[PDB]
């Protein structure tokens, strides 16, 4: 069959590209994915990683985990109930999550059924030739051919996949993929990694753990959440610890064996040991290029295995493009979506556009959460002669009364002190992911600190802290910090 | 007895002006208030209305009230407990609120001690003359002088006070002042009015009512929350009703009598009756100008009764300024604070600056809450030839799981369709007040609809809806509503 565009991967970026090309530019579009609905064996499916085993279900589960705090915090506001009757029923959470995910799967199925010139093919997509995509039964390229798709244009949008370290007992560990399908909440769990997935799942498991349970997070480096504002890294470490999570920094698993009762015996490089029910590896995500047989067409990969692209998502092969996590840049759903829309506008609309990967607002659904947009001060200080940091950090009042006195809200604005231009805004505390969205719009408009502090506050909010900072807390001058 | 600046009212505007004048410009500042800490008899105190009987305690109490929803909603996420054991201990809430407000009162006492020039005087400020404030023992002008303050500049910042309709049995009724100190949560309460205070308190009382409880909100006109986006007014009405609050619109109390059991018998203008334990009147706040004795220096008041001011907070009398609720405009703490900061940066910084009264972000801590900045479409439609309205309204997925299907999140962007300039943004749903703050910054920067839709979403959030709207839902062309442009 013949298509203007063939999309391999029916995910965040692939569906944006395919839908736009079919509906906005009237192109005949084929989209390929390995599964029509979530979960084992391939986990990701129609809708992509975010829908099936990412942002969507993880946010529902963090929302679930937040009730542990709400139930405890309610007491400060005079709420009374039988604390000994309280159970976190993980089975109910997982069933609720599964129904929500399946409903989305179903709605994408309906979207393909109801959208003429947008066709779905089930199976494993690979490149046979520069204008032919082959859809096969399995990831094995010797598996049976289901389809051969003639393509003027080919989009690679297969996303990423959890990295598993080649250690003894790796087979006894899981990734986020399996975590979404644990039938029972682990009493003891080790999350391995200092990134958002490890931190977010540490919070989820901490809330649903059965009585006498314990969540441990291990990270090789000294301070979790590399890439984030350093004050927020330190504070979120403290606030996790305060909620009963054991943060093991400068620690990494050397191997895992089965205790006789089937639990996991963890040996760390430091010669520390930990017995847990689950070991969840969240150490990295790698681009999914192995199965694409890109050697059939000579698409250039990086040593990492990401598809190399120009700013317009073009590979070295004309008519073959790559967007989203497969490009191993910013692994966010809205970025994949933006890159897909920009590609289709460029290629099919002759409306040349490239995605801006700077000043992208993002969040960590830790408890409490992070919202951020733009540069951290250490990065800014290397690119700008004079950098100012505006910082406000305080336990909000609701949290004196709630009894969570540890829950400091951090609000930090990083500027180019030469002209006041805001380079970065970093938030820690309830609401942070919701606050930071419109800050993204501010940074697109080259907002200055004066634009923030001359805006009238909404009171009482945590967000109004952003509009209440007149005076720098400290500076970097030619890379050097000064009070 | 000699000051660069004397401030009457140690509230939102008065303290900002006071503390700025002293710390930024090393000026010598007197601040007068009637009370050092919250509650009866004068309710407002050091810190002002917001701190003592306003934004701060209200927000703690709405937060408390939110746990009624969280406890129920937890079940959808697998939380299990004995629902029959749940009690809302109002007395605990009020004790906690009182301790939190007192600590802020003590905070401001600290501030006034730990700061040179900045000195607090207790008692009732009034104007003797152009350059003298007299502090007396009471609000009666005949009462004893405690101090006579010499004033190069005078700031009136006395705020507002609840209006109580002059109906038979008004003495059986309370205002928000007394609501903060009720010794028991009412089983049955009538909140009178359709503004933010009535709506917020209906939410609070609804969460803390004892078993067999009922919250009734009445409003004299057809639809609550005049001045808010119409879609949001209708939606808040539905979402309050869904959570058990009875909304009586086109209804207004004509009188109240005490029943023999101490309950209140409300007769409406319509002839309807209702028995409640509390009648809380929230029909308006009026500027506090009586007690200042403004007749003595001829400070001009408005046809409404607020101190008349120019864009620089200047009265008709040189050296005499007025900020915040006494000016009877937008009665918000951050506006008072902004006006104070501008007045001082102007007069003592020699850096004139005028508060911008447009594009002010504000919130209603309704359950669920409102966040809004700038013009509602009906107002835009009278000023601009072509207005576009972008609307997204859906129950967020988490509330399909929670069981609160009625919690529709509403996001509306109102534009000047001629250039795409955002004129207003109207949000209803969890997080709306937090979402809207940086939208205020966007509007200051003359953000267009394309600045929103070209910004990359934060996923998953409610806020990202504001970055997902490319196509108008409908328009106003020369005031006329229509689905499509001509
Ligand atoms: C646990 C977790 C949480 C996350 N949380 C967030 C968050 O909150 N917010 C956020 O913005 N981002 C989040 N992300 C990242 C986000 O999921 C990804 O950035 C996004 O899904 C990438 O989109 P994409 O189009 O590159 O690919 P994907 O959405 O991953 O889609 C790729 C698709 O290709 C399919 N596929 C792969 N190989 C083949 C093949 N050969 N043939 C056919 N189909 C194939 C897969 O089945 C998959 O459906 C999260 C990720 C994870 C793992
Ligand atoms: C129930 C309620 C809820 C509110 N919620 C919010 C909210 O969430 N957000 C928001 O932004 N705004 C809110 N407001 C409004 C906010 O409280 C006011 O806008 C703000 O306090 C006005 O500041 P101001 O400086 O004009 O005066 P105030 O802060 O009212 O300070 C005036 C002070 O003057 C003193 N005073 C009066 N007369 C004299 C005199 N003659 N001599 C000496 N002292 C005197 C009083 O004791 C008082 O302390 C709320 C108001 C109420 C009543
Ligand atoms: O790991 C994440 C992440 C995951 C989810 C949300 O954020 N990031 C992105 C934001 N980062 C940046 O440094 C910004 C570009 C400047 C690095 C850390
Ligand atoms: O009553 C309130 C209010 C009280 C607390 C928060 O908002 N408002 C603000 C919004 N309004 C406006 O008209 C905006 C200026 C345009 C009028 C209604
Ligand atoms: Br580190
Ligand atoms: Mg179709
Ligand atoms: Mg002092």
mmCIF file of C-alpha atoms and ligand atoms in Angstrom, chain A residues 111-119, ligand 6:
data_model
loop_
_atom_site.group_PDB
_atom_site.id
_atom_site.type_symbol
_atom_site.label_atom_id
_atom_site.label_comp_id
_atom_site.label_asym_id
_atom_site.label_seq_id
_atom_site.Cartn_x
_atom_site.Cartn_y
_atom_site.Cartn_z
ATOM 1 C CA UNK A 111 -9.717 8.113 16.086
ATOM 2 C CA UNK A 112 -8.049 5.791 13.431
ATOM 3 C CA UNK A 113 -11.467 4.197 12.594
ATOM 4 C CA UNK A 114 -13.163 7.644 12.187
ATOM 5 C CA UNK A 115 -10.282 9.630 10.472
ATOM 6 C CA UNK A 116 -10.110 8.934 6.704
ATOM 7 C CA UNK A 117 -6.549 8.860 5.285
ATOM 8 C CA UNK A 118 -5.061 7.951 8.707
ATOM 9 C CA UNK A 119 -4.544 4.156 8.954
HETATM 10 MG MG1 LIG C 6 -8.615 5.860 9.285
#
